[PDB]
From a paper:
In addition to focusing on the DARPin components, we also set out to extract as much high-resolution information as possible from the stable core cage component, this time by masking out the dynamic parts of the complex. To push for the highest resolution possible given the dataset, we created a mask that excluded the flexible DARPin components while keeping the core cage of DARP14 intact. Multiple rounds of 3D classifications and refinements using tetrahedral symmetry were made until no improvements to the map were observed. A final set of 277,091 particles were postprocessed using multiple rounds of Bayesian polishing and CTF refinement to obtain a final map of the core cage at 2.7 Å. At this resolution, we could model nearly every side chain of the complex. The map also shows possible sites of ions (mainly in the 3-fold trimeric interfaces) and water molecules (not modeled). At this point the resolution of the core cage is likely reaching the limits inherent to the sample and data collection parameters.
Here, we describe and detail the use of sub-particle CryoEM averaging and present updated reconstructions of DARP14, a multi-subunit tetrahedrally symmetric protein complex. Originally described by Liu and Gonen et al. (2018), DARP14 was computationally designed as a scaffold capable of displaying small proteins for CryoEM. DARPins are small, ~17 kDa helical repeat proteins that feature variable residue loops capable of selective non-covalent binding to other proteins, akin to antibodies. Variants of DARP14 and similar scaffolds have since been generated and used to bind and image small proteins, such as GFP and KRAS.
Author numbering:
A (entry chain V), F (entry chain W), J (entry chain E), K (entry chain M), L (entry chain U): 2 to 119
B (entry chain B), N (entry chain R): 23 to 100, 103 to 163
C (entry chain D), O (entry chain T): 23 to 163
D (entry chain C), M (entry chain S): 23 to 99, 103 to 163
E (entry chain H): 2 to 55, 57 to 119
G (entry chain Q), H (entry chain I), I (entry chain A): 23 to 100, 102 to 163
Write the structure that this text describes.
């Protein structure tokens, strides 16, 4: 699976981005749906970002988990909930209000997916 | 009053009854955990029976399940036959009935678009029951 | 030979086996009640397996169940919903009640498809109510 | 996977769990028999879940079941289920074995696999009935 | 909804990226489909990019991610609004015209997790 | 179509990202499914990245090809295989073991897709 | 000559007729806007009747609708109101509801034939603009 | 009491109501013509609601419509125009579109029950006449 | 977001818009009655759009409609007449036909989802009251 | 039910055909699907027989069990397996290689089946 | 059609197997379903046989009628009943109790059936 | 597969039953549908037989081929035709008229079929 | 005629045309065999097109095919198709015979006719394989 | 992108390829005729693939085919086995594949109402191919 | 045993036979390429006939096809559509390409109904492209 974590530059985290990625990888591996070395995570910081139309500076944290198809909505919902809990635990603050944390779980088509090891 | 709704509610009632049966063979911490699980299953039963009109479990219940799962995975060396002891056999039976309830709730979710969080809770509950059975076997 | 008939008979066999398991945790009076219930379930299974060709239970069996239900409602006072299995013996009867509900669903499918077993379904519903009452009575005692 | 496959695997797992629960009320010989039965049911679950890709049980398992059935039939001469608690556990296991047999029969009708598994489950239900009666007699 | 705007480094904009995000958020909110604080937009500049196999080119691509349950009319209108807003912000780039595209993809609502800290 | 190539910072390539994107664009155009100027490719380097839970150093290369809907699984699989071969032939090494190279081919909805030239 | 095609064309003709009826109660700029809308609806009608053989509206028509929508949202501040504060705004409310009906018909056509997504987007924006115009008339 | 029968009767009632609304903007001759049209539509409604049991309109009604159509085509010379050049013509354009909707409903009834072919022909001729009358009012 | 639900809400919106258009031709008492009717239709729309999650109209609304129906029946003595004796009554005739169309849509929703029986009863009583009001305006 | 057991003349059995038929009848009755007196078994020795095309001495033992229709594939498979186990246990040897033992379970049409007792 | 009559060695018949086959052939031809020369009947005596598990001497008579497909259940049942009546009248006695007489009418696949006259 | 050849006692063959079975086995193996060692053939002579009702001396030759299910009607018809050709070529004469030769191809249920090698 | 009948007749015509094309690369005896096969296909085509009213091939045609098959198996002991051009022609003919067999099998399943034609096509495919291998060996 | 459209285009491509393969065994006049036939099949393929949006062949193409058909019946004595000569066998194969393409185009016409003129052209083409094979055999 | 499986294997056998027929008109390099293609198609037939229980072609086969496609595209310059069969050898390859498209359609049906053969379909598509390129190369040469 592929995990992309997007955080705004004004967002403050309790731990480092690497520690957050390690915690997220442990949470994903705890599900039992993935091989250990197949879990690939990456953290991206956003420098140009807007939330809403109000003149209030905010922070948000979004993660997209891409998995191969064939898993049920129960598994997908549980993976999303696990990732969201980990991310919310990792958030310290940012902005003058609450930080919105959201997780997407999307399916990659298995038949057309290509994979090599060099 | 739809057939999948009745079947899922009945299977969840079965799961609650079996967990109540099994909670008399465990220690105080596990008994409290199982009582909390029974309350959560009753909440799920209410929200399924109301066809989604009544709010169900919150995400912090699934977070609590995941925290317990991680805690018990930290002490489980994770193939054995089910029921190394009678106490773990009871939890193995509860785990299989939780899988059956998960199947029924998945049917309900596929047909009516409700109960995804309930299905995720049932999946996490089955994982936790497996871990608890292994913990009892180890202890 | 019909799949609903096989499922209903299997679920009624399951109910009988679970009642026989649970009858070793109750006193003599409740054990006799449960043995009579097992005999009635055997009669119901004969009815269902014959697909109505063999007579099933009579109405005085449902009357007996109702008499027990009122007798035990006279002893049960609940103020709110309680978790199943406050005691192990009551937990066994709660499991029996849930399996009786499952058998009731199966017999309802059989009735809805073949026009037989309405009295059996009524008996299963009354049995579920009686099992709930017996579990609560054991918890109170 | 397919709905019948998932249902059959779940029911067989439930049967294994119930057998593991019931094996703590029997003697050493029956406990060993039930553990071997559990291993056979795991093999059946593997072959069902793989949709026949993985080989399942062999015919000598069914032969072993039939030998036990004969041995316990020569010891057994209408009663309510559960004359004792130990026999009641095996009666519950037998009913759940019949439920698993129904699920496996549905799988066999749908996909053409698991005839030997269904035969094993039928013989297992017969053996469980015989074992319950043996405990009641003893 | 989530909006990611990807622009090549050689692309010149009439307004700053922040002002472009402001305009895009206003256009999205004008549709009436989203809550005000739920609209999250982000601008990314591409440093390593190639368009085609031939000539210096620039392109501007945006992806709008919304939860499922909206009709193709709403999705097409959102895409058209975003494309118009983006096109009005392009001053030029490369030696040809700038290709501006907006893709609207639906996120599964049942498995979508959302929390506020 | 849109091609996003994501590479970890420790991944070593045989040639620079520019020539990698040239090779990828030539491979995509060789399929005949796209116009020449419609192929838009981009290379992103990942600075914060975890792979799995083990402590061994790893590198991975991921590409996502986005095409408009209406093409068959044969075309999608062939595009994925072409991209995967091109990417694998460009990897010199990275980490302490083999590099995992993966390619996703996902379809974009054609009806709601907006496009214009400025 | 499919049933959904005929229904969508009939409903679009209904919308055009109602807009032509309502354009006699508005001022000059709104009347010109409504005539432009009628021409756009006629192009949509041709495109749908041809089942996509003849080209329909362009994206700059939808852009023009969106610009008008933004301009009029700059002047509209609402709470809940009943339709038809005045007769002129009631005419536009009727036009809005018939635009929604035409949008439903065109959505059926789009689901069954894969054509008319831009027409449906235009109809949705047109319904929004008609709502805004009715509220502007009430305010003025 | 079939669903298509109820739909056709409702749409014909709607057409009659819209014609009765529009007849208050025309002169005496067109008002009398529209009243005769309303009576014919009521006969059609009775015939359809009875599901063919009660006799409907005769062929001389369609002949009268065709005579009016020819007379008014003798006065109409068109290119393309938008509906509603005047308010009175816009009323008749709305009536024409609703007549076409009623024609669609009656055609569904005819396809499913074998009744109402003459009613459908009458509705088609009525829509043609309404178009001609709108253009005549615009010219005048 | 079901097709019948969307169709029923759209038709109810059409009815509300037409009632708001027609309320500008009646006196103060009928105008207040029509505004109350519009509010009731909005409650019905909320109930239907929620698919029964939000409660709709109460029984005292239908009682109020029936009381008005009896009051106006005390004043109406009819034989057969064509719709639209005056423009004011023609507006209410159009409103009545659109109310019957909305009744058909709500009946479809009720048959498919088991909700909206009180809404359908209200729409039937509303169509009866609209007929009575049109006849009252014609008599006056 | 009807059971026909066919053995080649060169096949050697541990017990005589009478005891073989007794064992087969007991195995069939142990299934519980048949009445005691309805089980009719018969043993036939084959004098003219060939197995395959090679010039190798071979022996085989075949049984066909005919039952009335209405029983499931689980019951049929169990009956076949029981009969095959009994027959294999009864085989002592024969020919120059292993003896192939096979059992057919075929269903007779119950609706047109005629049965009378004299 | 093909008729195979199987009789145990202890079974006593009123008429010899030749007359039994003559009566069976006349009964089959009386149905009108077969050509005269197409009715082929054969009688087999069983020397190794067991009925049931009890130690009681028994005799049984079994016949199998094989016909091509395309005939209804009424015709098949009538053929079975006629054959069973003829066989029962042919039985004089045997064993220590009543003789069980059974007839099966099995249905041959006509499409793959090969037939030649030399 | 199982092949049973039934011949009347008055039937005269060009070659002995052993050569007839060899020819039949070679014909069956030439089809390519069976393993060499799985083809089991057997020849039976009928001592009590009548064909038809007329008082004419007759001889007939019948063979039944039993194969596992899953083969097409083309394959079954070809197998029947090959067996019938071999049998007819093996017939020398018998009776007062032509000898009727017939071949049945019947399918055994593969799912409940039991097989062991001792 | 029905669509399966038309498809089967068309595919049999294709097979006949391909056999006529391939018979110009073989020797005299195989050319005569292929001409006889072409006549047999035409009888099959007639009986298929008539939907069973016109009699088709007799059993001695299939017997002749089987005799040829045995004769050529006596001379034939995995290779890619088309060791030579002559054998490649017969391999193409064999594949088209397989396609015609599939069409005739569909006709047989839907209408109950053409079992002998399907058996002939199966034997013809086997004989074409054998002839291609014989040409390769020679 | 419908299944019958794709299948008809594939079969027409097959017919074109076989005609191009067989045109190397005939003389100059027949080779030119076959080249014009291939161009007509291109127009037919474009028309069918475009769902009738692109115009296909004109009626003068079918008229040209009919003129050739009568011209060649004037010199053909018109059953024989296909492939009296190798050149005529090639045209017999082309004729059978033209019949297959005609079947596919007839299917396309039955669902979509397009390609009647293409089907008529393919029928006339099969007749002409039969006549040309017989002409080669006679010559 | 399934109709689409039988149809796909028959069409793949047809493609293999046509390729084997066409390989006798090309030079040594193209003949070796076509023999490798025939081996790959046989591997695909095994995979399809087993319905996925037997592994089929690997990804390096498709990579080899793509490398050949690029190599021959470097040598092909076309300005407009041309009639198939400029020479007899290229006509053979055009016929092979059309039959490869037919096999691709059959394998696509199999993939849609059973979820197997995506790599086989990709191989068939690349093979169609390569056959087109080889025919054009023969025409140019």
């Amino acid at each position: 699976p592929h995990l992309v974590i997007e955080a705004t530059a004004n967002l403050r985290l309790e731990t480092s981005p690497g520690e957050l990625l390690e915690q997220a990888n442990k949470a994903l591996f705890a599900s039992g749906q993935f091989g250990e070395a197949d879990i690939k995570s990456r953290f991206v910081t956003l420098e140009a970002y807007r939330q809403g139309t109000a003149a209030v500076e905010r922070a948000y944290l979004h993660a997209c988990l891409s998995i191969l198809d064939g898993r049920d909505i129960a598994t997908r919902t549980l993976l999303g909930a696990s990732l969201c809990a980990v991310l919310a635990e990792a958030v310290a603050g940012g902005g003058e209000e609450g930080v919105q944390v959201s997780v997407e779980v999307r399916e990659m088509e298995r038949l057309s997916y290509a994979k090599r090891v060099v | 009053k739809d057939s999948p709704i009745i079947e899922a509610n009945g299977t969840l009632d079965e799961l609650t009854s079996f967990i109540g049966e099994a909670k008399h063979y465990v220690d105080e911490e596990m008994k409290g955990i199982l009582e909390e699980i029974q309350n959560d299953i009753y909440k799920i039963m209410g929200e399924i029976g109301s066809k989604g009109k009544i709010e169900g479990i919150s995400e912090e219940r699934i977070a609590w399940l995941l925290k317990l799962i991680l805690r018990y995975m930290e002490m489980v060396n994770l193939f054995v036959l089910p029921g190394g002891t009678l106490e773990s056999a009871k939890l193995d039976v509860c785990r299989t009935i939780a899988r059956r309830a998960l199947r029924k709730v998945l049917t309900v979710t596929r047909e009516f678009g409700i109960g995804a969080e309930a299905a995720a809770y049932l999946l996490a509950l089955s994982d936790l029951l497996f871990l608890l059975a292994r913990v009892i076997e180890i202890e």
